[PDB]
């Protein structure tokens, strides 16, 4: 009874970071050997658990959160980080107990002329609670004057496209990120 991990890491497309996908894993036999013993993962960083010790423990739920970000924004996927992704798109709790796996996916998610299917939130009145997301597309209100739904000054659209291109530098090249949280 193997785990759906094949349908997460080897998924066709990943959700945008502002609407990151979450999948629940339970009542399953998890094989973390296939993950750690794979060179495809540029970033494989675990907090609170050891990658080799992972197979020796059992948890009641494993949450796999999948999304796509930039290379420079991978650092923000860590407990106690500040940035666009951490503050407005995906916030991890400080007491994080889980792993983060990010690998470069330029030859999947970057396309000629810009990939505009991937978006991230630019603004929000308050930072996100950990493991909380909002898919709201309402026109961000930056100042006092009511927007009334007219984009313009202090009425900014909250979502911006990454515009992934295959000729970008490694920093801006897309990275697919899967966050495993154990409870």
């Amino acid at each position: 009874n193997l785990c759906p991990f094949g349908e997460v890491f080897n998924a066709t497309r990943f959700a945008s970071v502002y609407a990151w996908n979450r999948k629940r894993i339970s009542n399953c036999v998890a094989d973390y050997s296939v993950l750690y013993n794979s060179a495809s993962f540029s970033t494989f960083k675990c907090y609170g658990v050891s990658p080799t010790k992972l197979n020796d423990l059992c948890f009641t739920n494993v949450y796999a959160d999948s999304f796509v970000i930039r290379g420079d924004e991978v650092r923000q996927i860590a407990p106690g980080q500040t940035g666009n992704i951490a503050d407005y798109n995906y916030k991890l709790p400080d007491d994080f107990t889980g792993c983060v796996i990010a690998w470069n996916s330029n030859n999947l998610d970057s396309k000629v002329g810009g990939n505009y299917n991937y978006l991230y939130r630019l603004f929000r009145k308050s930072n996100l609670k950990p493991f909380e997301r909002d898919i709201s597309t309402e026109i961000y209100q930056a100042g006092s004057t009511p927007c009334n739904g007219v984009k313009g000054f202090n009425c900014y659209f909250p979502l911006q496209s990454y515009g992934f291109q295959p000729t970008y530098g490694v920093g801006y090249q897309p990275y697919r990120v899967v966050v495993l949280s154990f409870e």
Partner: antibody
Framework: VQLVQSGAEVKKPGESLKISCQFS????????IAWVRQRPGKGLEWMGI????????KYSPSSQGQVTISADKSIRTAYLQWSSLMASDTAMYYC???????????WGQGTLVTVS | DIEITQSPSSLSASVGDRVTISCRAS??????VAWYQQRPGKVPRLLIY???TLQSGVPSRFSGRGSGTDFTLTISSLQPEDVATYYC?????????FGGGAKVEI
Amino acid sequence: VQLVQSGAEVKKPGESLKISCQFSEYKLISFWIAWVRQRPGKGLEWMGIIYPDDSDTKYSPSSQGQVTISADKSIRTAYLQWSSLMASDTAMYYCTSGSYYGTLDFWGQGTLVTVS
Amino acid sequence: DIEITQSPSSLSASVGDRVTISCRASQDIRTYVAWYQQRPGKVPRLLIYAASTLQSGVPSRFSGRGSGTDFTLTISSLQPEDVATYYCQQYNSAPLTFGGGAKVEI
């Protein structure tokens, strides 16, 4: 991947046209098809690109409003759709595919379009 | 857009001679120039990736060189097989533009 196209076309300047290109069973989502045009004597020109898996299309500025590029994934064929043609479109059209970087590694045979 | 300007349109050299074909880009493209060869009748054939890397099946006679603005394709000892036209494409950024032609006749 192999690319086979429709065939030679003879039309009139006002006529509209459809040009077909078949795919050899792509595996990756980042499988783009570019259409390039070579007018007689003149060099190659890059018209547009399409990603059939998500059907995302980009056009060069020259051919933005003139042509359209579609891709039916089910029958696995891309099409260059021409509206009312011009005498300036008597060219050889190549359906190409290649690396995710956009380089044109694989070429199909040319479709010869002539309008009078 | 990005404008590509090539070498003289016509080059003539003897069999066994060394031939150079250079093209320059208006803006700065790092190394993303491909080089294609179109024989007089046949479909164009991709020769070179980002200028340096060859293509499987291409004899090692051809050589890519250059970076930034200026790029160059060089051919060692010629054969009648290489009387084609050579184009340099820039695949940096959007509209992937092409250069002019470089006709080669023995």
